[PDB]
Amino acid sequence: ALDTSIKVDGRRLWDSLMEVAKIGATPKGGVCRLALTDLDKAARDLIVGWAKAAGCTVTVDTMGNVFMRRAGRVADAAPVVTGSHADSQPTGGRFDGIYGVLGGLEVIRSLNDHGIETEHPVEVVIWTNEEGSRFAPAMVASGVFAGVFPLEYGLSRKDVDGKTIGEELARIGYAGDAPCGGRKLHAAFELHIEQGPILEAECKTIGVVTDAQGQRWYEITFTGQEAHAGPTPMPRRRDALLGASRVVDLVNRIGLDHAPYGCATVGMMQVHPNSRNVIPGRVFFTVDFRHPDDAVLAKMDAALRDGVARIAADIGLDTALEQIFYYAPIAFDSACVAAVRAAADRFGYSHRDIVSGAGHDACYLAQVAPTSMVFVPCIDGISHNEIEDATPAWIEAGANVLLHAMLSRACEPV
Amino acid sequence: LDTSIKVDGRRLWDSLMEVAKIGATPKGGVCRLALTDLDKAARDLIVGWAKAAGCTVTVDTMGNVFMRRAGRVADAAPVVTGSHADSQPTGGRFDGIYGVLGGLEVIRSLNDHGIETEHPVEVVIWTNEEGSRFAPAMVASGVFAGVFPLEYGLSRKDVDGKTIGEELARIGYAGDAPCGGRKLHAAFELHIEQGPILEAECKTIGVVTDAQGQRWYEITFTGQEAHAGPTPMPRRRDALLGASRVVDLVNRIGLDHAPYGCATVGMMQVHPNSRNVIPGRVFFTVDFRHPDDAVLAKMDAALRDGVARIAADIGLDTALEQIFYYAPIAFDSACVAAVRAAADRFGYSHRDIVSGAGHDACYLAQVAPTSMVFVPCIDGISHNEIEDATPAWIEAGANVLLHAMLSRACEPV
Ligand SMILES: [Zn+2]
Ligand SMILES: [Zn+2]
Ligand SMILES: [Zn+2]
Ligand SMILES: [Zn+2]
Numbered sequence: 001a002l003d004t005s006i007k008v009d010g011r012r013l014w015d016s017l018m019e020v021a022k023i024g025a026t027p028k029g030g031v032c033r034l035a036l037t038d039l040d041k042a043a044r045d046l047i048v049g050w051a052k053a054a055g056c057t058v059t060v061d062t063m064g065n066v067f068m069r070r071a072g073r074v075a076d077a078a079p080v081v082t083g084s085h086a087d088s089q090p091t092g093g094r095f096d097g098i099y100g101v102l103g104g105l106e107v108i109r110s111l112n113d114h115g116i117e118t119e120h121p122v123e124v125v126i127w128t129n130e131e132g133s134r135f136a137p138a139m140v141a142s143g144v145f146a147g148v149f150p151l152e153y154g155l156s157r158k159d160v161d162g163k164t165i166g167e168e169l170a171r172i173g174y175a176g177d178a179p180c181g182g183r184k185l186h187a188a189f190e191l192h193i194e195q196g197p198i199l200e201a202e203c204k205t206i207g208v209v210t211d212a213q214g215q216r217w218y219e220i221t222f223t224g225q226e227a228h229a230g231p232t233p234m235p236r237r238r239d240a241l242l243g244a245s246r247v248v249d250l251v252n253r254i255g256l257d258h259a260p261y262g263c264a265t266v267g268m269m270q271v272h273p274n275s276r277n278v279i280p281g282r283v284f285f286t287v288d289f290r291h292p293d294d295a296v297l298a299k300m301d302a303a304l305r306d307g308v309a310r311i312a313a314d315i316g317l318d319t320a321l322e323q324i325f326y327y328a329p330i331a332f333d334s335a336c337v338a339a340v341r342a343a344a345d346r347f348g349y350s351h352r353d354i355v356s357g358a359g360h361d362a363c364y365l366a367q368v369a370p371t372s373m374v375f376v377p378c379i380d381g382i383s384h385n386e387i388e389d390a391t392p393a394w395i396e397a398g399a400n401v402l403l404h405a406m407l408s409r410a411c412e413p414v
Numbered sequence: 415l416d417t418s419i420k421v422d423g424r425r426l427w428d429s430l431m432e433v434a435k436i437g438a439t440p441k442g443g444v445c446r447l448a449l450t451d452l453d454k455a456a457r458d459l460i461v462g463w464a465k466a467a468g469c470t471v472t473v474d475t476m477g478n479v480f481m482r483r484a485g486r487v488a489d490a491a492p493v494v495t496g497s498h499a500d501s502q503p504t505g506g507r508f509d510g511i512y513g514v515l516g517g518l519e520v521i522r523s524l525n526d527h528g529i530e531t532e533h534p535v536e537v538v539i540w541t542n543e544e545g546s547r548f549a550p551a552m553v554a555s556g557v558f559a560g561v562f563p564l565e566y567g568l569s570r571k572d573v574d575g576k577t578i579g580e581e582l583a584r585i586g587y588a589g590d591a592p593c594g595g596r597k598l599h600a601a602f603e604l605h606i607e608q609g610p611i612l613e614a615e616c617k618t619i620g621v622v623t624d625a626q627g628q629r630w631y632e633i634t635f636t637g638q639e640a641h642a643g644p645t646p647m648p649r650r651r652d653a654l655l656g657a658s659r660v661v662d663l664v665n666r667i668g669l670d671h672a673p674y675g676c677a678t679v680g681m682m683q684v685h686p687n688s689r690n691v692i693p694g695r696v697f698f699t700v701d702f703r704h705p706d707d708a709v710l711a712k713m714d715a716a717l718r719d720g721v722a723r724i725a726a727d728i729g730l731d732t733a734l735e736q737i738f739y740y741a742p743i744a745f746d747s748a749c750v751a752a753v754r755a756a757a758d759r760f761g762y763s764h765r766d767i768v769s770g771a772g773h774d775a776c777y778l779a780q781v782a783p784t785s786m787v788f789v790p791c792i793d794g795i796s797h798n799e800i801e802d803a804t805p806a807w808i809e810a811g812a813n814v815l816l817h818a819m820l821s822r823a824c825e826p827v
Contacts, residue, residue, distance in 0.1 A: 090686040091639045091694065133688040196644030213643075217689065226504045228797040229678035229701040230626075231609030231770025234668050241679055242665055245658035252655055255647050265642035266654055268689040269682065273503040275546040276630065276681040276699035278797045281504065286689035288642045357644025384641040384691045 002346055006114050008403055010396030013106040017395065020046065020086075020102065021094040030386020031094055035087035035129035036064070036168035043086045044126060044174060047101060051124065054108050060176025063141040063154050064128040064169045067178070070108050072121040072410065078186035080118075080410040081369075082107065082402060083125030084361065089133050093388020095193045095378065095395075101126055103191040103399045110403055118410040120186050127361040128169070134159045136286075137217050137325030142361035145181040146368045148327075154180070185369035187336060187409040190362035191402040192373060193390055197381025198354060205397045206344040206351035207375025210337055212363045213261070213355055214297050217325035218287035220247065220308065223318040226273060226281030238316045241271055241280035250307045251287055254300050262300065263290035263357065292355055294328045330363055336372035336405070343374075343404035349397050358383075370409075374401050417760055419527050421816055423809030426519040430808065433459065433499075433515065434507040443799020444507055448500035448542035449477070449581035456499045457539060457587065460514060464537065467521050473589025476554040476567050477541040477582045480591070483521050485534040485823065491599040493531070493823040494782075495520065495815060496538030497774065502546055506801020508791065508808075513604040514539055516812045523816055531823035533599050540774040541582070547572045549699075550630050550738030555774035558594040559781045561740075567593070598782035600749055600822040603775035604815040605786060606803055610794025611767060618810050619757040619764035620788025623750055625776045626674070626768055627710045630738035631700035633660065633721065636731040639686060639694030651729045654684055654693035663720045664700055667713050675713065676703035676770065705768055707741045743776055749785035749818070756787075756817035762810050771796070783822075787814050 023043045024033035033039040044066060048058055051068035059067045069079065084100025104124030111118065127145075132138025135157040144154040155166030169175040194200075199207050224238030248266045255264025265288040272282040287304060291297040305321065312319045344351040354375055356363075365371045376398035379389040436456045437446030446452045457479060461471055464481035472480045482492065497513025517537030524535070540558075545551025548570040557567040568579030582588040607613075612620050637651030661679045668677025678701040685695040700717060704710040718734065725732045757764040767788055769776075778784045789811035792802040 089688055089691055091688070091691055131688075132690065136689060138690065194644070195641050197646070215643075226798045227795055228608050228771060229680055230628075230676050230703050230772070231607070231794070231796070232676075233610070234665075234672065234676065239665070239678070241661055241682065245661035245679075248654055248658035249662070252647075252652070259647065263643050263645075263647065265652070265690070265692055266658075267642055267691050267693060268687050269654065269684045270687075271680075271682050274681050274683075275502055275504070275544075275797075276549060277545065277551065277678070277701055278502055278504055278680050279678055280680060281798070288690055290643050358641060359643075381644070382638075382640055383644070384688075385639045385694070 004347055008106050008110045008396060008399040010392060012109065013102060013399055014392050014395055016102045016105065017094060017099065020098055026386050028386040030388065031088045031092040032090050033088040033092060034090065034134040035131060036165065036172055038172065040087050041172035047105065047126065050105060054112060056108060059178045060174055061178040061180040062151055062176055063144050063180045064174035064176060065141050065145060065180065066126040068124045070111065070122045072118045074119055074414045077120040077414045078184045079121040079123045080186050080406050081123040081125055081188045082190060082406060083127065084190055084192060085127050085130030087129060087131055089131055089384050091384060091386055093383055093386060095388055095390050096195065096383050097130060099193060099395065100191045103402050106399050107403045107406055119412060119414055120410040122406060122410050129165060130361055135165050138359050139361055139364055142364040146364040147181055148364060151180055188362060188365040188369050188371040189336065189402055189405050190360050190373045191398050192360055192375060193378040193383065194375045194381065195358050195378060195383035199375060199377035200379065200381060202352065203350065204352045205349040205394065206401055207354035208337060208341045208344065208351050209332060209356050209373035209375050210353050211292065211329060211331050211355045212359065213290050213292040213357055214294055214327055214329040215325065215359055216289045216297060216301055216323055219322050219324050220287065221282060221284045221320040222312060223282050224315065227279045229277040229279055232279060237279055239279050240283040240317055243311050243315050243317045244269060244283040244285050246311045247308055254303050258291060258296055258300055261292050292329050327363065330366050332366055332372035333370035336370050339405040339408045340372055340374050340401060343401040346404055347400050374398050374405065415759055421519050421523045421809060421812040423805060425522065426515060426812055427805050427808055429515045429518065430507060430512065433511055437501065439799050441799035443801065444501045444505040445503050446501040446505065447503065447547040448544060449578065449585060451585065453500050454585035460499065460518065460539065463518060467525060469521060472591045473587055474591040474593040475564055475589060476557050476593045477587035477589060478554050478558060478593065479539040481537045483524065483535045485531045487532055487827045490533040490827045491597045492534045492536045493599050493819050494536040494538055494601045495603060495819060496540065497603055497605060498540050498543030500542055500544055502544055502797050504797060504799055506796055506799060508606045508801055508803050509608065509796050510543060512606060512808065516604040516815050519812050520816045520819055532826055533823045535819060535823050542578060543774055548578050551772050552774055552777055555777040559777040560594055561777055564593055601775060601778040601782050601784040602749065602815055602818050603773055603786045604811050605773055605788060606791040606796065607788045608771050608791060608796035612788060612790035613792065613794060615765065616763065617765045618762040618807065619814055620767035621750060621754045621757065621764050622745060622769050622786035622788050623766045624705065624742060624744050624768045625773065626703050626705040626770055627707055627740060627742040628738065628772055629702045629710060629714055629736055632735050632737050633700065634695065634697045634733040635725060636695050637728065640692045642690040642692055645692060650692055652692050653696040653730055656724050656728050656730045657682060657696040657698050659724045660721055667716050671704060671709050671713060674705050705742050740776065743779050745779055745785035746783035749783050752818040752821045753785055753787050753814060756814040759817055760813055787811050787818065
């Protein structure tokens with residue numbers, strides 16, 4: 001239970017992270033590699049090539065998810081899968097998502113290095129457009145896989161220029177032939193940086209992820225009337241940016257009113273016509289709500305809808321409000337969680353139970369297969385900023401835990 | 415009260431409908447930003463009309479276009495009129511272009527009636543008056559009037575980094591004439607009111623006596639982009655939260671100086687503008703106006719104090735620049751009286767009025783006797799594609815412009 005002779009090559013994994021970090025590297029040392037751009041294509045191509053060199057067979061499904069499979073002893077056994085996303089935010093870091101993909105690749109290579117045959121096949125997956133930034137919402141491709149969304153929904157999500165996921169998959173050559181979903185998975189694990197400050201602040205090397213908080217995302221367009229910034233008398237103006245700005249403040253208030261765990265953000269805003277001497281006549285913006293308790297998240301939802309109506313009524317704005325994304329907080333599989341904890345104890349790593357504050361493809365996999373996650377810390381807990389960072393020690397430790405948690409389940413007899 | 419010398423209202427209205435085709439939008443407005451190919455097309459068309467009406471044409475270093483109808487005295491200083499042909503992105507069919515085409519109609523009407531003036535008469539197109547694509551407004555007439563150095567006018571940049579100077583060269587309006595320097599005998603600008611007063615009070619003509627002051631600002635808040643989820647709420651430095659609080663503050667400052675205070679945030683750029691990233695940088699603009707310079711200065715102080723307080727509470731870095739300021743200005747009393755007498759000549763109803771917008775005439779007033787003629791606009795709406803005016807209003811303002819110009823252009827040298 002403490003045999004540590006089977007372990008990852010930490011430098012090989014770290015160097016693979018530094019190598020993929022070049023694809024979309026930014027001057028501040030981060031990654032700008034939006035989903036289904038040519039840069040996303042190059043990271044996929046590169047990793048697929050590495051996986052094939054490590055003896056994997058590769059398939060690509062209709063949402064562009066990439067499955068890199070290492071055969072097991074039992075040909076038709078359900079796989080133990082791991083993986084994450086290769087796409088990033090525009091202000092993305094070198095570790096969000098890509099660590100889980102490359103950690104999976106390192107598990108494959110380490111099984112080869114040690115000559116280990118597993119009972120179940122093992123797979124590493126790249127999930128498409130996990131961030132939900134260029135096309136919204138997040139996690140749609142694993143949502144299709146898990147049966148939450150129909151394929152036609154995933155393919156029709158659009159970017160700000162009207163390009164669909166389906167068009168861009170075809171453009172970069174990842175409009176795959178395999179069905180999206182359907183296959184039974186034996187178990188799933190995703191390795192990820194925490195994206196918050198807890199593990200680092202508490203000197204814990206491993207986060208044993210037990211739950212993932214829920215989220216609700218919205219799109220709101222206020223319509224008022226564009227008019228002259230000068231001789232339009234102040235009381236009769238219908239300023240859509242005044243309305244949107246008041247909702248930005250309301251959204252923050254709603255976050256703070258559900259402390260300590262409420263999260264609330266307006267991250268995206270488009271003003272029309274955006275001319276300095278024209279009262280804005282139309283403003284589009286997003287709302288991001290999260291809480292670990294479904295009832296509290298629903299309370300935040302009701303408070304937003306009520307407050308938005310009040311703000312629009314006071315100014316005289318028309319409101320188009322859509323909740324474009326919702327999933328309830330989810331508990332990960334107890335046996336998977338135990339396997340992650342057991343793997344941390346095997347190596348003597350410090351650990352604590354933790355709730356994921358971000359969404360991950362694993363949150364949707366948990367609906368169809370026994371799933372949990374492995375966290376490592378990140379420096380100052382920052383993510384979605386180009387200074388996102390992790391130490392070599394953390395990177396290696398998380399991959400050792402992933403390796404043994406996966407081994408534990410993939411060696412169960414069929 | 416002799417009204418035999420009057421404009422051709424149909425010819426002027428038709429000219430407005432023709433130019434409105436250049437940049438026409440689905441909503442029935444005009445999207446013809448300064449120094450685009452569409453701005454070039456409107457300039458080219460109007461210049462060709464002016465030359466066919468017997469004008470000689472010059473272009474100065476800021477791209478201002480001077481279409482000149484000679485007078486009896488070859489070297490007398492001109493009586494000038496004119497406005498801008500560029501529009502807002504949500505522009506109407508009358509803002510600016512009416513004063514240009516009204517000037518052209520004056521020239522054609524002088525030709526129709528065989529009138530020789532003592533002073534030459536000129537119609538002018540002033541470059542980039544709106545200050546939307548390149549900011550601030552009125553920079554080309556400001557250069558002309560000696561308010562801004564030429565190199566400042568030429569170096570104003572759009573959101574893609576293109577300068578006025580390079581776009582002038584690109585559309586062929588980097589002219590050879592010096593910008594400013596010529597003495598002007600008098601100047602008049604015809605313009606729609608852009609507010610509701612003249613229509614609401616059933617007055618055909620606004621005798622513009624003053625133009626209110628303005629201060630424009632650019633502000634960038636810098637915080638820290640971070641995850642919209644697991645970044646703990648109390649430690650966030652959200653630049654859009656800060657900017658949004660300033661939008662509300664700006665509105666409050668405007669309302670604190672009712673009824674004449676004007677305050678607007680019209681432009682904002684969020685970075686990185688991703689829905690699950692706390693905004694780390696936000697650029698936005700502030701537009702302040704008031705007819706009283708001391709009140710406008712109070713608005714400035716309240717903005718600077720409030721911005722600093724908002725930034726200090728969140729933990730944001732602030733770059734704040736006032737990029738534009740001119741004090742309220744009173745137009746020339748004799749020009750104002752000429753406009754009033756022209757209204758009375760035709761029996762038009764009128765009232766004195768203060769311009770709520772800026773116009774090139776505001777800067778011309780610093781170097782020559784200047785005033786303005788207003789006509790109403792429907793529902794007082796401007797900078798919206800539904801901006802509208804009746805044919806009666808358009809014709810009446812041009813008749814007043816014609817005789818106010820004639821009154822000054824026929825003064826012996
Ligand atoms: Zn991620
Ligand atoms: Zn992310
Ligand atoms: Zn104008
Ligand atoms: Zn205007």
